[PDB]
Ligand binder design. Structure first.
Ligand SMILES: *[C@@H]1O[C@H](CO)[C@@H](O[C@@H]2O[C@H](CO)[C@@H](O)[C@H](O)[C@H]2NC(C)=O)[C@H](O)[C@H]1NC(C)=O
Ligand SMILES: *[C@@H]1O[C@H](CO)[C@@H](O[C@@H]2O[C@H](CO)[C@@H](O)[C@H](O)[C@H]2NC(C)=O)[C@H](O)[C@H]1NC(C)=O
Ligand SMILES: *[C@@H]1O[C@H](CO)[C@@H](O)[C@H](O)[C@H]1NC(C)=O
Ligand SMILES: *[C@@H]1O[C@H](CO)[C@@H](O)[C@H](O)[C@H]1NC(C)=O
Lengths: 165, 165
């Protein structure tokens, strides 16, 4: 009726979902997470304090094996937009971060769900801006003609290879 | 069916669980918490302010006597990953901390549960990065040839020996 089609689609896939548990049903393979980084601005290079302040655009993609649906049943609907707090999210971490509060470094609002089939799961896309404060060891031997290299390490803090890759 | 085995495992052990109460059933012995510390970086040594800024990796391990299960009933499942806010956590404190807000010094996301038997409980593993700001009394008698010793005290603020060891 007047209820949008996306309303019953969300009710259908969120019925038995439990966002506190890892959403994988297959035998023993992990959940593959793909990370993409875009650099937008180098805000600051603090030499006396030796940290780098970066503005980047982050994109994460993975397959949620519990959120698939058949488009033919929902008006040929293939995508749906949902809040990031309603589903399971990987705990991607910056190992050498100088900021512990993720509220001051990230802005997560919504996720995009694209069905792969009723039992195939749905591909999840996560987009968000970030401001990373990373520790950098600066070699000022050739100052002021020096070249610096900054390394950012990303990974999961609690999940090993058998769970998240 | 299509529901992952870990879904009904969580429903089984979280049925009567109450995370607001200490999870011990034995006669009078306390809960033994083992703490492990790894130093990753000395961020700063503020001499005029006399505090030390440390980047450490913390591991906490204890047995939850209410969260045991029999693996034979759940597809030989022995581990499970859960959110840290779903179970009881010890109130480990840094006595000489200069920062009261734990959001700015810690990053707790998930815990690992390993069954010890149906009525034996489960071993809980807690991993998280920290940035400790500890007050240090600096003795600059031999400056700039001085050696400094920094002490960090850890314990529970509200639980005594008979509860948490
Ligand atoms: C995640 O990535 C792994 C690669 O490490 C994928 O494993 C492949 O699986 C296909 C079958 O779907 C095989 O044909 C390939 O030979 C495998 N590659 C390797 C290197 O093992 C896995 O399928 C991906 N998807 C998951 C785990 O859900
Ligand atoms: C926590 O640690 C205490 C040690 O302080 C453990 O007490 C031991 O218990 C075993 C039996 O399981 C005895 O054989 C040992 O002699 C005890 N040692 C001491 C020093 O009393 C206790 O079992 C551990 N586990 C708890 C309390 O759950
Ligand atoms: C898409 O689904 C709608 C709803 O049933 C249907 O009317 C339409 O023919 C479908 N189109 C394609 C290309 O599948
Ligand atoms: C592990 O549990 C599964 C589930 O019943 C069973 O099929 C398998 O034989 C068990 N293996 C061992 C080594 O216990």
């Amino acid at each position: 009726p007047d209820i949008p089609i996306q309303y019953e689609l969300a009710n259908n896939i969120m019925e038995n979902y439990q966002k506190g548990l890892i959403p994988k049903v297959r035998k023993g393979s992990p959940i593959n997470v793909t990370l993409s980084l875009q650099l937008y601005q180098i805000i600051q290079v603090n030499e006396p304090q030796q940290y780098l302040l970066l503005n980047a655009w982050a994109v994460e993609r993975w397959v949620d094996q519990m959120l698939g649906w058949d488009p033919s049943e929902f008006d040929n609907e293939t995508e749906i937009m949902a809040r990031h707090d309603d589903i399971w999210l990987p705990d991607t971490t910056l190992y050498n971060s100088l900021e512990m509060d993720d509220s001051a470094s990230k802005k997560l609002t919504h996720v995009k769900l694209t069905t792969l089939g009723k039992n195939q799961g749905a591909m999840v896309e996560l987009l968000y801006p970030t401001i990373y404060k990373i520790s950098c060891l600066l070699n000022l031997k050739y100052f002021p003609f020096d070249t610096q290299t900054c390394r950012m390490t990303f990974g999961s803090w609690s999940f090993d290879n058998s769970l998240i890759d």
